[PDB]
Amino acid sequence: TLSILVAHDLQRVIGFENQLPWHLPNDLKNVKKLSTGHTLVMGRKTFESIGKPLPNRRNVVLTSDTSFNVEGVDVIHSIEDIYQLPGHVFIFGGQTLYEEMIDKVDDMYITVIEGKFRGDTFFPPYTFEDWEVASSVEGKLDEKNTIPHTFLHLIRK
Numbered sequence: 001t002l003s004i005l006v007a008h009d010l011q012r013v014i015g016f017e018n019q020l021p022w023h024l025p026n027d028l029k030n031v032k033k034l035s036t037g038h039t040l041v042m043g044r045k046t047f048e049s050i051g052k053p054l055p056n057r058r059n060v061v062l063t064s065d066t067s068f069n070v071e072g073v074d075v076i077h078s079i080e081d082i083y084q085l086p087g088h089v090f091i092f093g094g095q096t097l098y099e100e101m102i103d104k105v106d107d108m109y110i111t112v113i114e115g116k117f118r119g120d121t122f123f124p125p126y127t128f129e130d131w132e133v134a135s136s137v138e139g140k141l142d143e144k145n146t147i148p149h150t151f152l153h154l155i156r157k
């Protein structure tokens, strides 16, 4: 399976200044559970802002950097190398990845952040007429999770 995993806001903001604009541990928990024991594919900037691979799953970084050789990370230099990755593969971002991959994925796991944030990076426009809602679960608003959010699993129609 080839999936997208993204958190985006009402205006499809995904990032600001190489960081996430909001702080939503529920969504981190959702990522962890969904991708633990599987593969995350991310662009180099996303990797460099995380700072280290996420534990208990294969971390794959896409970069044109021929000197890239990070401990605990696998590197690919071409989009086409994604299709050779075995198992359940999640396109983990950021913007360039989502743009290159939106038309190829089976499937998208989207956390809709029900707010409008200052952003400099975006999820591409998509229509609910190409995508069927397999599940829509309202996130629990919280002490520690203070923005309304909805977990979507969408499957290509």
Ligand SMILES: NC(=O)C1=CN([C@@H]2O[C@H](COP(=O)(O)OP(=O)(O)OC[C@H]3O[C@@H](n4cnc5c(N)ncnc54)[C@H](OP(=O)(O)O)[C@@H]3O)[C@@H](O)[C@H]2O)C=CC1
Binding pocket: 005, 006, 007, 008, 013, 014, 015, 016, 017, 018, 019, 020, 042, 043, 044, 045, 046, 047, 049, 062, 063, 064, 065, 077, 078, 079, 092, 093, 094, 095, 096, 097, 100, 121
């Ligand atoms: N809300 C969310 O779910 C997520 C948010 N983000 C956010 O997104 C932002 C980063 O997004 P963005 O700036 O687009 O960057 P990316 O993380 O997508 O990284 C861009 C880099 O990835 C590499 N790359 C992409 N495509 C190719 C290709 N076809 N061949 C070779 N290398 C390639 C290049 O690295 P190189 O220059 O080394 O060649 C490129 O410059 C940050 O703000 C981050 O916080 C990221 C993921 C999820």
Ligand SMILES: CCc1nc(N)nc(N)c1C#CCc1cc(OC)ccc1OC
Binding pocket: 005, 006, 007, 018, 019, 020, 027, 028, 031, 046, 049, 050, 091, 092, 093, 109, 110, 111
């Ligand atoms: C955890 C944020 C997130 N949620 C969903 N649903 N999908 C995603 N692809 C992401 C992401 C991301 C990149 C990222 C994660 C992070 O937490 C460990 C810290 C920084 C990040 O990039 C700046």
